[PDB]
Backbone:
């Protein structure tokens, strides 16, 4: 069995949910129809490391419909949907992923996506978080200098370092010969992208890399629209609270905060915003939101939402000043936006999964969601498929561009070209009934663009 | 054991949830504090027939805190929350309710709320749907005319009639004796209020009844704000679908439909509305919604919501014209807004509990929610506590008024007096931080009102 | 010349503006087309007393297209548009109206609409404010008892009383014989309607009267939609102020205040509301508005809008606490919502017409619009034609109903029947592209209405 | 008299309006207070060419309060407010501007800002549209090559070239001598910035230039918020039309179109959008607007707004398909968004100033605003002061930076540094009551920024 999944019997269920997801992921489905004849990924052998969910499944089969051969693993030990994995295997793709897998299994499975049968090699990486890429790069270094895997600080490292030693025993140059076949990497997260920029700095980047995280279509959907669609859903599943008439404070008015504010206001909450950036604060104010400090908000608001990407924006003294049964949640950085640690010295009482009462020295209670982790993933189900369709359609056009024209690119990190970012948007228009107009020749000349785009300058903010 | 519940062990859990709910139900709690000293319900013996949930538990303990003696049953066989029932019993109230009870047990439990110890009788009814009222009125007539309980249309009538026949054997004047002791009824639903108006018309109403359904505070919260708060919640739990960019059609632009349109629009849907009432249609047009026909919408919309209270507003031929994986749901009348029965001829495939695929001959599928029953109750959790607080504060003030001043009233159906309706609203203001202003003497005279209210004429529409 | 206008030469201009207004008044234009064949007003001789504007002109010619003969005057000395009057005369209708006419001329012109040539008599009154109706009723009394015009308090009375004495000299029973021919009155304002209710009380109402002021379509358009369309326009014409980011306080959250709040929020103002009615306050709160006292708002808000219909809701001490260059206006009762009188002791400095600086003892200035009169009429141009189309379409269907079936009605004040209120709405649907649906027989029975309406019970609030 | 204005008598009026405007322009006023002591512009001699309005007067006196010596002209022959010019002259600034001046007078006035007394020279240019900059650059080249001012395309060039030829006769090196003294230019318009980038490309830029057009604060206020605030204002002054229930189409969904759509929707219009950019189109779809074609909209919409910056986006055949009395206007490029010229073949009829009927052969009419020029400027009063405060605070900070630190800059076009852009926003917060928060040291390090800013990376889109 060239796969490791929870239970292949879950395949039929997975296929039914794939069939449903496809309708909500028109960008991916339309790429299949458009590039059918050309088979642009014929000859591509893609190693993929990305949350093994139903939506990722639609991406896998798009890559296959375009001609790719694919091996897949999850980028997280808990994010796999076992029935999705099952259905993808049943359809003929090696998957090494199950929910609740150990760290040892995680790093093993990250090797498996790079062990192709019949003397073959992966020639593309599709990554989320950069673990797959990190494995080849660090393993290659360990070949020359074992010391780099000699002193593991944490738990993830013990498992990573150990897995590398195990493969160096199979083949003393296990990693470098595999790295030599990679034609391109496409990466979609902030952390993965930071890692690539550092490799480039260190002269350690041996192929072109596409930063897809910073495209307009990916960032708007992943940040603004995705969280707008999901904040209130998580709050309601957890608490069933009435939103109308409540004071809700959103910390941060970037893309995530903008979406949060908009959804809360759409239900009749009074929305306050906190900010450290005066441009963002002024944007919030021009939408009729009151811009306040968290000190001011702390004893007044009913609902607190953190969207700053920063550290301890809701702190011990804020919570201490809070109203009884104030609801506190986080939709920003995966942790530490709220100082949950500083409340651990007080009585807690579980209300239900991902919902807890914290009881302060005076008997005043606060309701905390997902233990200060991401409310949209802990109390709801994360981004809807249409949102993920925009992210994954980016990843797909990036794979096509590097596999197909990667020789035109240096061994550097590149943001997706505007014309492909525009194409991502265009691929989603028919689903939602939007009719795109066309410039005439005179009009294209008049505003100084090609009829085919790109339509805006690189500095354009949308 | 003067109670029948699922499991008395659930009491501690129920008490924890009651403690949470109280903070979201300020009308009930503030009533407890305001009327504490007066104990206006001392000497009241209330037979209640109302969904035995955590929220109803808060109402029950409010009635008790005001001096009432109380016995309770559910008005529905499936709506009971067993931990709620348990906590209320443990706190000293007879309850006759558990989730999933039978129709035989249902009607028996309806008798038990009228069986008081120490030779005492119920003197007040707090009703939802009118079953408690019906039992006594039908049963009383059946004492002198067994023909009324002779021809059961219906599985519910079969159970009802049996229980009457069974009690007639114990005492030929079981109902009669009890009916004569009722000083008043308070009723909060359309169905219950229709039954009362019909009794009044027939001269069969032997006590004053308060119609609390048609109060402004009750109708607004129960119809408009409640459904606004919970429509999308149900759709998202069921489907996790992206709302932005979708065409959603709402059939009906009354209170319910107004709330629906408003929540869908708040998330970036294009909202279309159908209507038969030109006034309601013009209202919709003035908020920027296109007013369309269901025939026009059938093959164009992505989301269908029925809010008409009418019959087969989505029919077989509409569903057949629908777009593949269109979502169809009902938030209006309990059933028959959608012609679900006409699709039973087709293969169905369950997606998950309360979510079904209907497969048409050409392979096109429709996603139907809650089998065409109520999506906010089937796929979500129903109205939030603050909403129910408005309905139940209406019931409480109605009980106080009829118990303490019923002599002032005739044997008719009255809508809650405007000043009590205003009181319901007022009791909810402190929670949401709304500061009410006071008229001066000059100002009250200038507009022709008392400083204490009521503030509007009886025909005022708000 | 059976007319008195400013200048008949203005007719061509007026006709051009009539032709423009008709497109925006589909209710009136559609009545013409629908009732063409029937000529329901053939035999009607309508005396009309209503602001002689372009929009009223479209009403006059609708009445004529339906078969009426008409004589017209203004209900206000300043509201006439001279080119409208000119165009209506040129088309063959006697008009007695010009802007800036004296009180003597006003009362003379009110007689002229009741002096028909060739021994004829008016048999219908179309009134706004009840002056026309008052003339006949009071004149009739003076015939029997001169004392009722013996002691005039004010300026309007001196002119009224004098005009009556003058006509009693022509014909000692000038009024009563004219009153005897009136088959019906239709009245559209609050004041006019109060006067009718008082006549009825006093047994002094000799014909049926329609209160059109309280119809749903007239009240929603005249109160809510009209002021929503126009508040910000008046503020901007006067001040050119940026609305976004300002705190704007609306006193009152009835129909006018509701519209005001909604328009201000639509431009990104932070909107606060004050209220004395807790139901209205709770409505405001459920839309996310903060409900505050004027004492709280006075030193904080940038923009103050009064919509209460009450007395001195913005008072001396409020203005004294105001921020420098706060803008103060009134869209409610025609005066005394603001205590402008109490500021008259302080320096004023005109900024431009209808805009004044008030300079307080400490040098802090406030900007007052229209001297505390109606901002939408003083700084903008009042209600748009579509709004007036709803009012006047009411007046027209009321005229048709009383002329045509007035024998079915007692000599009482009646609100317009719901089926005619619905018809008003329906007549406006085609213009705005709204497609009204139709009940089937089964559906009409199911919800208990006729297919033709009315569709809602009398107590329905919309 | 070192000035040329319409009437110095208008000065007191102008001063009154300047005093009002100041309260709505907190960025300029707060700059005066903050930099008072430092007098950073002491030694600066600023030649300004910018619309001589009341708002520009506030900018001028801010520059003076900071130590600058200043001479001023308008950048447009018709934009001058004569009372503003007068007040600024009376307060001691040479101004060369009056409303309705000729092109000959225009260019002469442009020379006068460069003629300083006591043998001194301008050392800074504050420009709008780039005419002041062009004069010196073109004129300098013309000294050594008279061919550049030999072939005038254009009535404006005829005037420009004459004035250069006239000054060349007085001094063959008139421009040269002056050009060499310029330390910097600040430019705020698209046209001016394009000219600067073209000079830079040709190596013809002898000093650092700040592009203030593309700052976030300038572009947002000038493009989005400014047009949002004033679109409907213009339409209503022109037509007094009802907006609710109308279909309004906005061509373009960039900054301007985004603001338009938002204001129209806020009043209950159904808003459709056209676009050629799929990203912008998806943005519109995500806010619930239908994205349509102008061909589809042509015969359906009631209101047409062009915001594309493109050429003939409304053409002859669109207008011919339009609904009778459709309103057509342009808020985008100064002209040629609508093919007005193609309708000159038809009879026109003026409705009023800036409002015209275009009469088609079949008698169908279209209402065109401002003859297809800018409706916010033609039918209203342009941007409000708070908006202009953001543009002019940008200019002020740009002047301070180039004057005090220009040595740090090369002879290129720079966009305003992000930290100054942030400063513009910050300076506007106190007015609107927005409370900015401060990062702690730990928080600044955690997200990788200085506590003082800048807070975002250069590619951040807001
Ligand atoms: N929950 C999710 O599923 C999800 C999805 C996408 C992104 N994110 C995360 O959300 C976070 C924010 O994302 P974004 O795209 O909005 O980033 P952003 O940088 O665009 O916006 C963050 C905002 O927070 C403000 N801020 C920083 N510190 C603050 C403080 N101490 N107080 C008040 N405001 C402060 C900044 O000025 C900034 O405008 C990131 O960590 C991102 O990774 C989460
Ligand atoms: N889901 C819930 O939890 C919940 C809560 C409250 C009320 N309701 C129910 O929702 C239904 C509607 O309630 P409401 O308060 O909005 O009633 P309503 O009478 O105020 O509104 C119903 C609207 O539907 C329109 N309508 C009737 N038949 C139609 C048809 N064939 N096509 C288009 N429109 C049609 C009517 O003209 C009307 O204006 C009722 O059955 C009510 O009991 C449900
Ligand atoms: N400006 C116009 O062109 C125009 C058009 C229509 C109506 N009106 C007038 O506007 C006024 C209001 O009309 P409406 O239809 O909204 O009336 P309404 O009675 O429906 O609403 C008035 C509201 O003001 C509140 N109120 C009374 N005194 C108050 C106080 N002291 N402080 C705060 N709130 C207070 C009341 O509770 C009420 O809800 C009336 O005088 C009406 O004639 C003006
Ligand atoms: N009226 C004013 O006072 C004022 C103020 C600021 C800017 N503007 C002007 O408005 C215009 C637009 O400004 P912006 O900042 O929105 O520019 P922008 O580039 O941000 O937006 C223009 C939009 O129009 C779209 N477009 C181009 N041709 C089109 C076509 N044929 N059909 C449909 N869409 C088309 C583009 O795709 C684009 O996204 C510019 O000319 C600008 O100078 C006017």
Residues:
């Amino acid at each position: 069995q060239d796969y490791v999944v929870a239970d292949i019997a879950l395949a039929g269920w997975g296929r039914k949910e794939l069939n449903i997801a496809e309708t909500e992921m028109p960008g991916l489905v339309q790429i299949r129809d458009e590039y059918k004849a050309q088979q642009p990924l014929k000859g591509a052998r893609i190693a993929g490391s990305l949350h093994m969910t139903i939506q990722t499944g639609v991406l896998i089969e798009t890559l296959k419909a375009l001609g790719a051969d694919v091996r897949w693993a999850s980028c997280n030990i808990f994010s796999t949907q076992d029935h999705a994995a099952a259905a993808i295997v049943e359809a003929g793709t090696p998957v090494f992923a199950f929910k609740g897998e150990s760290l040892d299994e995680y790093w093993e499975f990250s090797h498996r996506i790079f062990e192709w049968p019949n003397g073959e090699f992966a020639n593309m990486i599709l990554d989320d978080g950069g673990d797959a890429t990190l494995l080849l790069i660090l393993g290659s270094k360990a070949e020359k200098d074992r010391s780099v895997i000699a002193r593991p600080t944490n738990e993830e490292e013990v498992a990573l370092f150990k897995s590398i030693e195990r493969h160096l025993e199979i083949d003393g140059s296990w990693y470098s010969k595999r790295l030599a076949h990679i034609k391109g990497v496409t990466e979609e997260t902030t952390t993965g992208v930071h890692r690539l920029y550092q490799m480039e700095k260190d002269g350690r980047l041996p192929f072109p890399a596409f930063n897809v995280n910073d495209s307009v279509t990916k960032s708007k959907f992943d940040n603004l629209y995705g969280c707008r669609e999901s904040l209130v859903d998580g709050i309601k599943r957890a608490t069933d609270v009435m939103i109308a008439g409540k004071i809700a404070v959103v910390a941060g008015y970037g893309d995530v905060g903008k979406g949060c504010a908009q959804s809360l206001r759409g239900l009749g909450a009074t929305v306050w915003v906190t900010e450290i950036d005066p441009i963002c604060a002024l944007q919030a104010a021009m939408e009729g939101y009151r811009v306040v400090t968290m000190e001011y908000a702390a004893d007044k608001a009913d609902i607190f939402v953190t969207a700053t990407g920063n550290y301890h924006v809701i702190n011990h003294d804020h919570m201490k000043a809070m109203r009884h049964n104030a609801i506190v949640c986080n939709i920003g950085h995966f942790d530490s936006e709220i100082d949950v640690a500083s409340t651990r010295q007080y009585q807690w009482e579980n209300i239900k999964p991902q919902v807890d009462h914290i009881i302060f020295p005076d008997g005043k209670r606060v309701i905390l969601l997902a233990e200060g982790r991401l409310v949209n993933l802990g109390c709801a189900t994360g981004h809807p498929s249409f949102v993920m369709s925009n992210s994954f359609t980016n990843q797909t056009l990036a794979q096509i561009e590097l596999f197909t024209r990667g020789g035109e690119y240096a061994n550097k990190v590149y943001v997706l070209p505007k014309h492909l970012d525009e194409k991502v948007a265009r691929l989603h228009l028919a689903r939602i009934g939007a009719q795109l107009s066309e410039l005439s020749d005179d009009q294209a000349a008049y505003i100084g663009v090609s009829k085919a785009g790109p339509f805006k300058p690189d500095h354009y903010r949308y």
